[PDB]
TrEMBL record, chain C:
The lineage of its organism: Eukaryota, Metazoa, Chordata, Craniata, Vertebrata. This is DNA-directed RNA polymerases I, II, and III subunit RPABC2. Signal peptide: none annotated. The gene is POLR2F. One of its GO terms (cellular component) is RNA polymerase III complex. GO terms for biological process: transcription by RNA polymerase I; transcription by RNA polymerase II; tRNA transcription by RNA polymerase III. Keywords: DNA-directed RNA polymerase, Nucleus, Transcription.
Length: 237, 171, 82, 128
DNA sequence: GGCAGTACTAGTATGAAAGTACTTGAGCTTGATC
């Protein structure tokens, strides 16, 4: 669980919502979560998220206590500048596997190495050696590469490595706006890598960490599995 | 690259073809079914050179078609990464190079063109040239490319080439 | 095996005559040339049954002996039981 | 995984023989003459047509006998079908260029020797 | 007007078969040693 990471509250109307860990409590009891409220401002009560309209809740009244942008309302819910900032038990949230969406990032390092990929050494006296991954650990990978013309296994920390690739090999986009798309890399630039997708020849330029070596042919189906490229759709009646 | 190999086929004959011209129909059926086709295993079947042997026909159970195994010699075209071949430029665009290698198409990415070859839209026929105007690549020119990768989408193969190495380009 | 030394019954077993009149009628039923003069016959099973009594059916039967070998009998060489 | 620049080809292409664009053109010309004459056969496919003009357009030895002599010339040299066929089709003029285009040739012969074969080819070339 | 406690509701978490085959234990016989 990390501060400013995103977790999902287990219960309430806020159940499953992506929420940012505003504050990790030292006691490890609760965490302050940044949410967008799902409230009717007690007008309907004798819903989709919307930014907290402090003026509206004041208009509706009820349990409202304004203190600047910080406002306390109905059940000591805390809000500030349109968002919620309320503590929730750590036991009450889902701390792992959450991952915000890009949209959630708008609302509110990493290492990925797999045995079999070709990597390059970015620094050190061992710089510009390329080789294939034997094994992997989470930080100092102790990536045990088998470098070209080297029968020995060395150890490299993740931070010392990058995912290299000569032009013409198949690549997959691991994470990004393009993730799931595949292609052959035509040209490699400093940290820049350009490639043509398999589905369409429309160009793609991505960072060196966002590609991996996988020999599989392109899927041809969107995330969600409902639609696929080249299909007929109804846009409006 | 062009090859001369031995291939096989199963000719499914509709029952109407039977009668007198039976063996002849198999050969004519074969020529029509394999010539022009392409596969990932062998590539483009350019033409059937000779028919070595015709297998005894076996009635397929539950269907009218009877299958005659056929051994034939054919000419195939199967490209490989790193091989240099001559192509004809067919179209100049600001997006890259549209080329053709025999019956197979090949795309040369603009990113794989030396920086000296600026694209020039204002020229009468679109073309690719060096600012020095020394070398100009346009429609109908013969160029040397290196195949960087191949793909097979719906029995048809296409490739991607590059002009980054020395002694490539205009011929 | 050779045309000599064939060891099998010359008669057509009722299993072979069941699959011959079936396979032949399936061919006739798709535009296939008819060996025998057909007279008022729109039904393929009756046509294929007629070709059989006249021994006009163009099929050779491949009989696998149990040891892995085989023999090829044409439908004319065999003797129709019924 | 595979790469012709290192003569790593599939097992299937072992018993096969490479064909020069000139030889291909000849073979296609004979098959066409047969297709042409003896009617009652649909016109050939587009793949053919495109290949017929492309092969012709790049054929350097227009004479039957010449092609055979070139083939045999190289034949008596320790060459792999791929390396052989590639040099005959591209006909490079210098050892340097040759090695660059076909890296598998590195260390196979001395530049001098490679240039002898090249020079011989050039001599055999049926210029237009 | 606010905070704490209690109660209710919702969700989540756990007699009256027969036979055959295999394994284990006990007993008997043979071999080796004193």
């Amino acid at each position: 669980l990390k501060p400013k990471s995103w977790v999902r509250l287990k219960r309430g109307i806020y159940k499953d919502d992506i929420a940012q860990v505003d504050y990790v409590e030292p006691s490890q009891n609760t965490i302050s979560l940044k949410m967008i409220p799902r409230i009717d401002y007690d007008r309907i009560k004798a819903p989709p998220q919307r930014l907290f309209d402090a003026e509206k809740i004041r208009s509706l009244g009820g349990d409202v206590a304004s203190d600047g942008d910080f406002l306390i309302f109905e059940g000591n819910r805390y809000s500030r500048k349109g968002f919620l900032f309320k503590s929730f038990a750590m036991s009450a949230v889902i701390t792992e596997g959450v991952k915000p969406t890009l949209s959630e990032l708008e609302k509110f390092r990493e290492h990925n190495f797999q045995p079999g990929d070709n990597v390059e050494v970015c620094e050190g006296e061992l710089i510009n050696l390329q080789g294939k991954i034997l094994s992997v650990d989470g930080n100092k990978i102790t990536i045990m590469p088998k470098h070209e013309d080297l029968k020995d296994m060395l150890e490299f920390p993740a931070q010392e490595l990058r995912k290299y690739f000569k032009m013409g090999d198949h690549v997959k986009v691991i994470a990004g706006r393009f993730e799931g798309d595949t292609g052959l890399i035509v040209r490699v630039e400093e940290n820049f890598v350009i490639l043509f997708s398999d589905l369409t020849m429309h160009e793609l330029k991505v960072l060196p960490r966002d590609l991996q070596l996988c020999s599989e042919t392109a899927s041809g189906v969107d995330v969600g599995g409902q639609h696929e490229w080249g299909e007929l759709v109804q846009l409006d009646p | 690259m062009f090859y001369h190999i031995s291939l096989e086929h199963e000719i499914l004959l509709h029952p109407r073809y039977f009668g007198p011209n039976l063996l002849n129909t198999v050969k004519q059926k074969l020529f029509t079914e394999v010539e022009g086709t392409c596969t990932g295993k062998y590539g483009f079947v350019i033409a059937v050179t000779t028919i070595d042997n015709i297998g005894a026909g076996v009635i397929q159970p539950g269907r009218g078609f009877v299958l005659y195994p056929v051994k034939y010699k054919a000419i195939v075209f199967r490209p490989f990464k790193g091989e240099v071949v001559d192509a004809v430029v067919t179209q100049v665009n600001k997006v890259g190079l549209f080329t053709e290698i025999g019956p197979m198409s090949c795309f040369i990415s603009r990113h794989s063109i030396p920086s000296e070859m600026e694209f020039d839209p204002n020229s009468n026929p679109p073309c690719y040239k060096t600012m020095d105007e020394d070398i100009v690549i346009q429609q109908d020119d013969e160029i040397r490319l290196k195949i960087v990768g191949t793909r097979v989408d719906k029995n048809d193969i296409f490739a991607i080439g590059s002009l980054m190495d020395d002694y490539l380009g205009l011929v | 095996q050779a045309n000599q030394k064939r060891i099998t019954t010359p008669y057509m077993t009722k299993y072979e005559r069941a699959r011959v009149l079936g396979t032949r009628a399936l061919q006739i039923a798709m535009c296939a040339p008819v060996m025998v003069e057909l007279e008022g016959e729109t039904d393929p099973l009756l046509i294929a049954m007629k070709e059989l009594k006249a021994r006009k059916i163009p099929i050779i039967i491949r009989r696998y002996l149990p040891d892995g070998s085989y023999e090829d009998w044409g439908v004319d060489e065999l003797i129709i039981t019924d | 995984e595979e790469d012709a620049s290192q003569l790593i080809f599939p097992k299937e292409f072992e018993t096969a023989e490479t064909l020069l664009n000139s030889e291909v053109h000849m073979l296609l010309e004979h098959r066409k003459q047969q297709n042409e004459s003896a009617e009652d056969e649909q016109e050939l496919s587009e793949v053919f047509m495109k290949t017929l003009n492309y092969t012709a357009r790049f054929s350097r030895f227009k004479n039957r006998e010449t092609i055979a002599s070139v083939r045999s010339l190289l034949l008596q040299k320790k060459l792999h079908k791929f390396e052989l066929a590639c040099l005959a089709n591209l006909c490079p003029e210098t050892a340097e260029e040759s090695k660059a285009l076909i890296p598998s040739l590195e260390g196979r012969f001395e530049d001098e020797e490679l240039q002898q074969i090249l020079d011989d080819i050039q001599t055999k070339r049926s210029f237009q």
